[PDB]
Design a protein around this motif. Structure first.
Motif, PDB file in Angstrom:
ATOM      1  N   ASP A  88      11.863   0.694  48.972  1.00  0.00           N
ATOM      2  CA  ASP A  88      11.068   0.489  50.176  1.00  0.00           C
ATOM      3  C   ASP A  88       9.543   0.726  50.074  1.00  0.00           C
ATOM      4  OD1 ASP A  88      10.876   3.632  50.901  1.00  0.00           O
ATOM      5  OD2 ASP A  88      12.943   3.193  50.311  1.00  0.00           O
ATOM      6  N   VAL A  89       8.755  -0.316  50.327  1.00  0.00           N
ATOM      7  CA  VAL A  89       7.315  -0.124  50.389  1.00  0.00           C
ATOM      8  C   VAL A  89       6.860  -0.305  51.830  1.00  0.00           C
ATOM      9  CG1 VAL A  89       6.934  -2.541  49.699  1.00  0.00           C
ATOM     10  CG2 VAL A  89       5.038  -0.884  49.573  1.00  0.00           C
ATOM     11  N   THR A  90       5.981   0.602  52.245  1.00  0.00           N
ATOM     12  CA  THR A  90       5.388   0.627  53.568  1.00  0.00           C
ATOM     13  C   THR A  90       3.887   0.442  53.388  1.00  0.00           C
ATOM     14  OG1 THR A  90       7.106   2.170  54.376  1.00  0.00           O
ATOM     15  CG2 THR A  90       5.026   2.054  55.672  1.00  0.00           C
ATOM     16  N   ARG A  91       3.280  -0.434  54.182  1.00  0.00           N
ATOM     17  CA  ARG A  91       1.827  -0.537  54.178  1.00  0.00           C
ATOM     18  C   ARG A  91       1.364  -0.481  55.618  1.00  0.00           C
ATOM     19  NH1 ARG A  91       1.290  -2.590  49.029  1.00  0.00           N
ATOM     20  NH2 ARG A  91       3.004  -3.931  48.253  1.00  0.00           N
ATOM     21  N   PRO A  92       0.922   0.712  56.064  1.00  0.00           N
ATOM     22  CA  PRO A  92       0.508   0.894  57.463  1.00  0.00           C
ATOM     23  C   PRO A  92      -0.702   0.039  57.834  1.00  0.00           C
ATOM     24  CG  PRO A  92       0.883   3.024  56.396  1.00  0.00           C
ATOM     25  CD  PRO A  92       0.905   1.981  55.310  1.00  0.00           C
ATOM     26  N   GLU A  93      -0.580  -0.657  58.966  1.00  0.00           N
ATOM     27  CA  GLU A  93      -1.590  -1.576  59.483  1.00  0.00           C
ATOM     28  C   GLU A  93      -2.798  -0.867  60.089  1.00  0.00           C
ATOM     29  N   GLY A  94      -3.668  -0.363  59.211  1.00  0.00           N
ATOM     30  CA  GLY A  94      -4.891   0.368  59.549  1.00  0.00           C
ATOM     31  C   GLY A  94      -5.518   0.886  58.262  1.00  0.00           C
ATOM     32  N   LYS A  95      -4.769   1.751  57.577  1.00  0.00           N
ATOM     33  CA  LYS A  95      -5.208   2.475  56.379  1.00  0.00           C
ATOM     34  C   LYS A  95      -5.416   1.619  55.123  1.00  0.00           C
ATOM     35  N   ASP A  96      -6.006   2.233  54.094  1.00  0.00           N
ATOM     36  CA  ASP A  96      -6.280   1.554  52.819  1.00  0.00           C
ATOM     37  C   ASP A  96      -5.376   1.995  51.633  1.00  0.00           C
ATOM     38  N   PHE A  97      -4.135   2.366  51.934  1.00  0.00           N
ATOM     39  CA  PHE A  97      -3.164   2.791  50.929  1.00  0.00           C
ATOM     40  C   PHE A  97      -1.789   2.277  51.326  1.00  0.00           C
ATOM     41  CE2 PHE A  97      -3.575   6.315  53.992  1.00  0.00           C
ATOM     42  CZ  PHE A  97      -2.258   6.456  54.443  1.00  0.00           C
ATOM     43  N   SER A  98      -0.831   2.351  50.411  1.00  0.00           N
ATOM     44  CA  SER A  98       0.537   1.982  50.751  1.00  0.00           C
ATOM     45  C   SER A  98       1.457   3.120  50.383  1.00  0.00           C
ATOM     46  CB  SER A  98       0.977   0.701  50.037  1.00  0.00           C
ATOM     47  OG  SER A  98       0.936   0.831  48.627  1.00  0.00           O
ATOM     48  N   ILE A  99       2.605   3.158  51.042  1.00  0.00           N
ATOM     49  CA  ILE A  99       3.516   4.268  50.888  1.00  0.00           C
ATOM     50  C   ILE A  99       4.700   3.865  50.008  1.00  0.00           C
ATOM     51  CG2 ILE A  99       4.986   5.928  52.146  1.00  0.00           C
ATOM     52  CD1 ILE A  99       2.009   6.207  52.679  1.00  0.00           C
ATOM     53  N   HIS A 100       4.913   4.597  48.916  1.00  0.00           N
ATOM     54  CA  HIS A 100       6.138   4.458  48.117  1.00  0.00           C
ATOM     55  C   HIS A 100       6.868   5.813  48.086  1.00  0.00           C
ATOM     56  CE1 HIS A 100       4.703   0.527  46.364  1.00  0.00           C
ATOM     57  NE2 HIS A 100       3.619   1.038  46.921  1.00  0.00           N
ATOM     58  N   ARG A 101       8.114   5.831  47.608  1.00  0.00           N
ATOM     59  CA  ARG A 101       8.938   7.050  47.542  1.00  0.00           C
ATOM     60  C   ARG A 101       9.758   7.175  46.241  1.00  0.00           C
ATOM     61  NH1 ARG A 101      12.883   5.955  51.615  1.00  0.00           N
ATOM     62  NH2 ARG A 101      13.548   8.135  51.347  1.00  0.00           N
ATOM     63  N   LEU A 102       9.886   8.395  45.730  1.00  0.00           N
ATOM     64  CA  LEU A 102      10.666   8.631  44.509  1.00  0.00           C
ATOM     65  C   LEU A 102      11.895   9.517  44.759  1.00  0.00           C
ATOM     66  CD1 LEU A 102       7.634   9.473  42.313  1.00  0.00           C
ATOM     67  CD2 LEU A 102       9.234   7.649  41.634  1.00  0.00           C
ATOM     68  N   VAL A 103      12.901   9.355  43.910  1.00  0.00           N
ATOM     69  CA  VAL A 103      14.020  10.293  43.884  1.00  0.00           C
ATOM     70  C   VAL A 103      13.942  11.101  42.619  1.00  0.00           C
ATOM     71  CG1 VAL A 103      16.449  10.687  43.979  1.00  0.00           C
ATOM     72  CG2 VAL A 103      15.483   8.652  45.076  1.00  0.00           C
ATOM     73  N   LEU A 104      13.618  12.370  42.784  1.00  0.00           N
ATOM     74  CA  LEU A 104      13.396  13.262  41.668  1.00  0.00           C
ATOM     75  C   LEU A 104      14.376  14.397  41.747  1.00  0.00           C
ATOM     76  CD1 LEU A 104       9.696  13.384  42.483  1.00  0.00           C
ATOM     77  CD2 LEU A 104      10.721  11.753  40.887  1.00  0.00           C
ATOM     78  N   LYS A 153      11.375 -16.126  59.443  1.00  0.00           N
ATOM     79  CA  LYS A 153      12.482 -15.223  59.162  1.00  0.00           C
ATOM     80  C   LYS A 153      13.270 -15.543  57.897  1.00  0.00           C
ATOM     81  CE  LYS A 153      13.101 -14.688  64.115  1.00  0.00           C
ATOM     82  NZ  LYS A 153      12.113 -15.743  64.421  1.00  0.00           N
ATOM     83  N   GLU A 154      12.654 -15.397  56.729  1.00  0.00           N
ATOM     84  CA  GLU A 154      13.375 -15.618  55.468  1.00  0.00           C
ATOM     85  C   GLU A 154      13.122 -14.492  54.455  1.00  0.00           C
ATOM     86  OE1 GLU A 154      15.624 -18.257  53.233  1.00  0.00           O
ATOM     87  OE2 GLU A 154      16.242 -17.140  55.049  1.00  0.00           O
ATOM     88  N   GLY A 155      13.470 -13.265  54.846  1.00  0.00           N
ATOM     89  CA  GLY A 155      13.484 -12.123  53.945  1.00  0.00           C
ATOM     90  C   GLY A 155      12.292 -11.179  54.007  1.00  0.00           C
ATOM     91  N   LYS A 156      11.191 -11.667  54.575  1.00  0.00           N
ATOM     92  CA  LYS A 156       9.877 -11.032  54.467  1.00  0.00           C
ATOM     93  C   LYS A 156       9.870  -9.617  54.984  1.00  0.00           C
ATOM     94  CE  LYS A 156       8.182 -15.061  54.111  1.00  0.00           C
ATOM     95  NZ  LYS A 156       8.597 -16.190  53.236  1.00  0.00           N
ATOM     96  N   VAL A 157       8.916  -8.847  54.493  1.00  0.00           N
ATOM     97  CA  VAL A 157       8.705  -7.493  54.956  1.00  0.00           C
ATOM     98  C   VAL A 157       7.546  -7.523  55.938  1.00  0.00           C
ATOM     99  CG1 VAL A 157       8.140  -5.184  54.289  1.00  0.00           C
ATOM    100  CG2 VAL A 157       9.530  -6.531  52.853  1.00  0.00           C
ATOM    101  N   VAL A 158       7.750  -6.959  57.127  1.00  0.00           N
ATOM    102  CA  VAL A 158       6.671  -6.871  58.103  1.00  0.00           C
ATOM    103  C   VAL A 158       6.427  -5.438  58.580  1.00  0.00           C
ATOM    104  CG1 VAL A 158       5.789  -7.672  60.304  1.00  0.00           C
ATOM    105  CG2 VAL A 158       7.184  -9.199  58.916  1.00  0.00           C
ATOM    106  N   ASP A 159       5.158  -5.035  58.577  1.00  0.00           N
ATOM    107  CA  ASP A 159       4.787  -3.702  59.010  1.00  0.00           C
ATOM    108  C   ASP A 159       4.358  -3.681  60.473  1.00  0.00           C
ATOM    109  OD1 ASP A 159       4.780  -1.453  56.830  1.00  0.00           O
ATOM    110  OD2 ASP A 159       4.169  -3.260  55.755  1.00  0.00           O
TER     111      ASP A 159
END
Lengths: 12, 371, 380, 12
Positions: free
Chosen positions: B42-58, C186-192
């Motif tokens: 899962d990648v998250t990119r918040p609509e405002g900021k200049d970074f993106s969020i990733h996550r690890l399982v450690l 609607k074909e898989g895309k990721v939306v924030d």
């Protein structure tokens, strides 16, 4: 046969 | 000859060279060393900021005592940050390996040193662990006598888990069964020494491959009625074989990693002939992963405290040298043996790697290197 | 304990014939956390029944999880013996799902599009007409959209009935998220998330759009507050109004589909509070009858003074707010119209049939799903 | 973890 993981890991 | 911390000299030189070696080096000291590393999808990119969020399982690896399964979130800078912990979960001993299930990434299976294979759902445990230190796993998978490392979820059969082990055996579980104890559906007794890694094939629900200290590659089929003899057999290396990884794009191509410092390329269609040997590591190899982006990119890591990145398309190219032509990059960022690494599934060329000196590095080589 | 609870079921069961015009029961292979009828009814000319469909989900111990659509045979206008030639309930389609379905809600403007809440915090969007009725045995989940904004799983979900493509989600991470998936193929895309409202400080339990004012929506959270939000407002950290709704967690709300100022909220203080948007310093009423937590509340889509609630007390209460103040001989307040005791476990969700008045679907933690309808003389 | 969702659902 544990020469994949060390003995005594250290804390930070 | 002791006192040889020549290691420090070369770390000093390496750091000074990153401005022209990486588009991104991040370093973080973990509270205990992690034996294991895997990005969550899962990648998250918040609509405002200049970074993106990733996550690890450690995981943790302590010295008496108290270990945790760890979820850490990672903020990565955009075209135009710092790494923190999301949740700790009490764990019976060191986490030899943590792997999420593709069909449900909430599900994580872990290998302990205690024979047991455990199954966690981290959405069903507190962000703040019970200080008692108690471990309450959602499943307890039984079959092994000893700890192991190799572990692999089946991408084409939900819930089916393979584990590799020191007891010389490989175990199969489908957890779709009944304290919270489930027994091996099947136990593959092919190997004669410690089994070092196991992995499912990426398209074929029925095939998987294992590696063991007997220097062997064995390819298994699950329809087979014989659990004492695999479909194929290879003498893979001239020493222990510690990991393997099927090509995520080429169904006949896999790679093996060995105590002999070489990376062996294999063709399923004919295992009697080794396709290639990547030689450049100066010590044992314990992990190998294909890049999930580019079909000809491969990485490896180990005791020589380095991570080699290979592009196998430049095999055979002429040069004047200081190493093979297919050798694309040497990541010299760690001052210890590397335990595990993981390609970022969403940010090409970004790799996470974790070592025995608690250093976790999220990094990416410079772009001019691969163009 | 299932001791006394069973005594009452033995009694409830024997009493159903003239408490109800229809009781149907069906045990699901796994328990559903979520339940909502699809708006569309199908009625073959020959037969004397018509076909409705629900949106259900699974909540397994492990295994694989699926988004489910089920078909229900509901009588039209015969007589027979109703719920006891007995009308059938089947699974029409399963779609592989990443973890349990926290909630499933179809889009009012396009009832094929369905949104689900996963425990991995992800919100997924499906078009079930784009998946086989028999799920892929690999077990891999393939959503047409992946909505990102949250850190933690949640439940609250609400499509905007006057703004196509606008979806709000509620969560344990204390946040509300807005997506506008309109210009989004609607074909898989990721939306924030377009916007994240951070008003609440605890787990947000539910959120719902106003039913006639496109800009307004309201959320409720474990911080015991009901907040009314405006999307025009540039401030997302403080909502237009705020109320201390209950003396415990606020788990749900539902705006009145006929009366633009009236909403109700449901909590862990065993009550349903009736609210007037025009003046939030005054709870209009407190419906008291439940004996344990409240987790769902819905207005009847047919009648403007009918309200229902459900929760842990394994009961579904149906309220009539016009009988506030009426005199009695009592066995509960006058506004209490019917006590549905058909479930012997905590009820997760219910949803009024949009085409068949007084028909309710309700599902509990022991995988029992009930399609039922009280007798007519109760509401005449 | 909520108090809305059970810990251990059962199969039928």
């Amino acid at each position: 046969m544990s020469r994949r993981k060390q003995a005594k890991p250290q804390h930070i | 000859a002791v006192e040889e911390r020549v290691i420090n000299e070369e770390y000093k030189i390496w750091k000074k060279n990153t401005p022209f070696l990486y588009d991104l080096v991040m370093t973080h000291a973990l509270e205990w060393p992690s034996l294991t590393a895997q990005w969550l999808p899962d990648v998250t990119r918040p609509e405002g900021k200049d970074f993106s969020i990733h996550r690890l399982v450690l995981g943790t690896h302590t010295s008496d005592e108290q270990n945790h399964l760890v979820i850490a979130s990672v903020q990565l800078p955009n075209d135009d940050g710092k790494i923190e912990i999301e949740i700790k979960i009490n764990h019976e001993g060191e986490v030899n390996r943590a792997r999420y299930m593709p069909q449900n990434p909430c599900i994580i299976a872990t290998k302990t040193p205690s024979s047991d294979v455990l199954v966690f759902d981290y959405t069903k445990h507190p962000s703040k662990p019970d200080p008692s230190g108690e471990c309450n796993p959602d499943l307890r998978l039984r079959g092994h006598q000893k700890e192991g490392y190799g572990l692999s979820w089946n991408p084409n059969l939900s819930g089916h888990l393979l584990s590799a082990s020191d007891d010389h055996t490989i175990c199969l579980w489908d957890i779709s069964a009944v304290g919270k104890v489930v027994d091996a559906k099947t136990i593959f007794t092919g190997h004669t020494a410690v089994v070092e890694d196991v992995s499912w094939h990426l398209l074929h629900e029925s095939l998987f491959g294992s590696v063991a200290d007997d220097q062997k590659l064995m390819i298994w089929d699950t329809r087979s009625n014989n659990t004492s003899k695999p479909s194929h057999s290879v003498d893979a290396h001239t020493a222990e074989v510690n990991c393997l990884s099927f090509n995520p794009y080429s169904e006949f191509i896999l790679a093996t990693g060995s105590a002999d410092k070489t990376v062996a390329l294999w063709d399923l269609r004919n295992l009697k002939l080794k396709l290639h040997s990547f030689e450049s590591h100066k010590d044992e190899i314990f992990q190998v992963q294909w890049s999930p982006h580019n079909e000809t990119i491969l990485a490896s890591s180990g005791t020589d405290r380095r991570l080699n990145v290979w592009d196998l398309s430049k095999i055979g190219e002429e040069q004047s040298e200081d190493g093979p032509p297919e050798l694309l990059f040497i990541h010299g960022g760690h001052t210890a043996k590397i335990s595990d690494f993981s390609w970022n599934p969403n940010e090409p060329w970004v790799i996470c790697s974790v070592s025995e000196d608690n250093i976790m590095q999220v990094w990416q080589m410079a772009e001019n290197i691969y163009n």
